[PDB]
Ligand binder design. Structure first.
Ligand SMILES: COC(=O)Nc1ccc2c(c1)NC(=O)CCCC[C@H](NC(=O)/C=C/c1cc(Cl)ccc1-n1cnnn1)c1nc-2c[nH]1
Length: 238
């Protein structure tokens, strides 16, 4: 996260750190708890991930230093990538992790509500991007979870900012015209959380941008409201 500040413990209890174990253990991506055995994240996080056996989901983490060999995690039973996914820049950048065991909800770990299909028209004015990602292009994963408040950008304005790309309504953009605050390397897969009527909603999934926090280059997020039926298809299968 660029231009962000340290989160407080329990502030974003749906935020997870997804680690890979191959060749050595390290943070791979962010993710969000959306159900008691479900993590919503970005499809591009699994580039070159041949098996769910190398994945570890850690919830209730503020500091990466809380994670050692003796730290409990959730194993991943299954990786579900959207069928239409090709690359982050073309959209459908969404995946679900079915966990091997159930998350016990509490003040340190609980789900974030999915946006309502009826609320596709609501204007979100209190949106925050969170993660342990870089503070600038050439940096390192941060110990403490960071947060940055960022305004949503219309599809029309985002399309003007990305000449040569096709910014669809299945993407949602966020950033200041002047730049300064954004997601960066290591934040992808994490949430873009917006508070509306005292309830937090998972509005976006950190996906891509041209550089980090650049002037007139908003961050591009998967527009979660457009995938609510796909999520229910995969999580509520009979
Ligand atoms: C010690 O552990 C370690 O260093 N781990 C570690 C470090 C870095 C990584 C990573 C793991 N994950 C990946 O490479 C897979 C995942 C690969 C893509 C991922 N993309 C982002 O996270 C976000 C991009 C992004 C999103 C928005 Cl909204 C705006 C600007 C963006 N950027 C443009 N340029 N940079 N960012 C990434 N992640 C990493 C490097 N790239």
């Amino acid at each position: 996260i660029v231009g962000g500040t340290a989160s407080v413990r329990g502030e974003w209890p749906w935020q997870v750190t997804l680690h890979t174990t191959s060749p050595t253990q390290r943070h791979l991506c962010g993710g969000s708890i959306i159900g008691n055995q479900w993590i919503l994240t970005a499809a591009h996080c699994f580039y070159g991930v041949e098996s769910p056996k190398i994945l570890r989901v850690y919830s209730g983490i503020l500091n990466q230093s809380e994670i050692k060999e003796d730290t409990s995690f959730f194993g991943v039973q299954e990786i579900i990538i959207h069928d239409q996914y090709k690359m982050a820049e073309s959209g459908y950048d969404i995946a679900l992790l079915k966990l091997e065991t159930t998350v016990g909800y509490g003040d340190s770990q609980r789900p974030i509500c999915l946006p309502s299909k009826g609320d596709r028209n609501v204007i979100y004015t209190d949106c925050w991007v969170t993660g342990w990602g870089y503070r600038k292009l050439r940096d390192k994963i941060q110990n403490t979870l960071q947060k940055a408040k960022i305004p949503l950008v219309t599809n029309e304005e985002c399309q003007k900012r990305y000449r040569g790309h096709k910014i669809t309504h299945k993407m949602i953009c966020a950033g200041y015209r002047e730049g300064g605050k954004d997601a960066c390397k290591g934040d992808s897969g994490g949430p873009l959380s917006c508070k509306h009527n005292e309830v937090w909603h998972l509005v976006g999934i950190t996906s891509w941008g041209e550089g980090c926090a650049q002037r007139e280059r908003p961050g591009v997020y998967t527009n979660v409201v457009e995938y609510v039926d796909w999520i229910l298809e995969k999580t509520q299968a009979v």
